[PDB]
């Protein structure tokens, strides 16, 4: 296993090199908005991002060492979390707005166009402001995103959860290595590490709420959701 032999800088280098691209939406600023059309734009974007996320997950150190059914499970549990932390990351320098795509920048008043959105919208904005106040770094972001993939489904004969916990420990070593490299004292390192992992608790909360909203939109059968998005959504209803 090459993942457990990577130095901290090698861990950062591999995660940065595996980053997926930032995709564009099909948003036309002259086509008038309908709550169904904004949903269609966001679910179309999420569907195309899922293909890149699957191949980004293959390039996460240690992920390939898992069985195919374990990979399927981790992605099923974590896909919306990873989309969300990616959303709030690229929205950091856009206070009060969410950058879904470079051509799709929404503020609060446009989230209320779709029902039940306001609360998910506000929590995403608060997470992004929290990242901006902490001056979250890209190297810390790619570490956090990999932790979500490996940790979000590590619970829900084959003691391969043990190997996952070893990779997670290596990423914690990588986070500490970065913070020391940035001049933080020992006390500051443990505190910032705790502050970052506590955000993940709220990203789980946002994903749980966002999954309930997505499922309701499927039942209202008003927005076309891709077959991949159905199966990912079906994996949380079950």
């Amino acid at each position: 296993s090459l993942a457990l032999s990577l130095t901290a800088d090698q861990m950062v280098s591999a995660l940065l090199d595996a980053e997926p691209p930032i995709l564009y939406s099909e948003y036309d600023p002259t086509r008038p908005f309908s709550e169904a059309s904004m949903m269609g734009l966001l679910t179309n974007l999420a569907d195309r991002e899922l293909v890149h996320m699957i191949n980004w997950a293959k390039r996460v150190p240690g992920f390939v060492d898992l069985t195919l059914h374990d990979q399927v499970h981790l992605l099923e549990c974590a896909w919306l979390e990873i989309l969300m932390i990616g959303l709030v990351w690229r929205s950091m320098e856009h206070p009060g707005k969410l950058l879904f795509a470079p051509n799709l920048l929404l503020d609060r008043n446009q989230g209320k166009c779709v029902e039940g959105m306001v609360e998910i919208f506000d929590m995403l904005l608060a997470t992004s402001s929290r990242f901006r106040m902490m001056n979250l770094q890209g190297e810390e972001f790619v570490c956090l995103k990999s932790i979500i993939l490996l940790n979000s489904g590590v619970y829900t004969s084959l003691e391969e959860k043990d190997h996952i916990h070893r990779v997670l420990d290596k990423i914690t070593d990588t986070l500490i290595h970065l913070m020391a490299k940035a001049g933080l004292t020992l006390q500051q390192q443990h505190q910032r590490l705790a502050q970052l992992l506590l955000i993940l608790s709220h990203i789980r909360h946002m994903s749980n709420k966002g999954m309930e909203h997505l499922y309701s939109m499927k039942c209202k059968n008003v927005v076309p959701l891709s077959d991949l998005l159905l199966e990912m959504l079906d994996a949380h209803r079950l």
Binding site: V51, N55, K58, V72, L75
Partner: peptide, 9 residues
């Protein structure tokens, strides 16, 4: 299973 298929590629 689409995810299984794409992961398998």
């Amino acid at each position: 299973k689409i995810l299984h298929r794409l992961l398998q590629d």
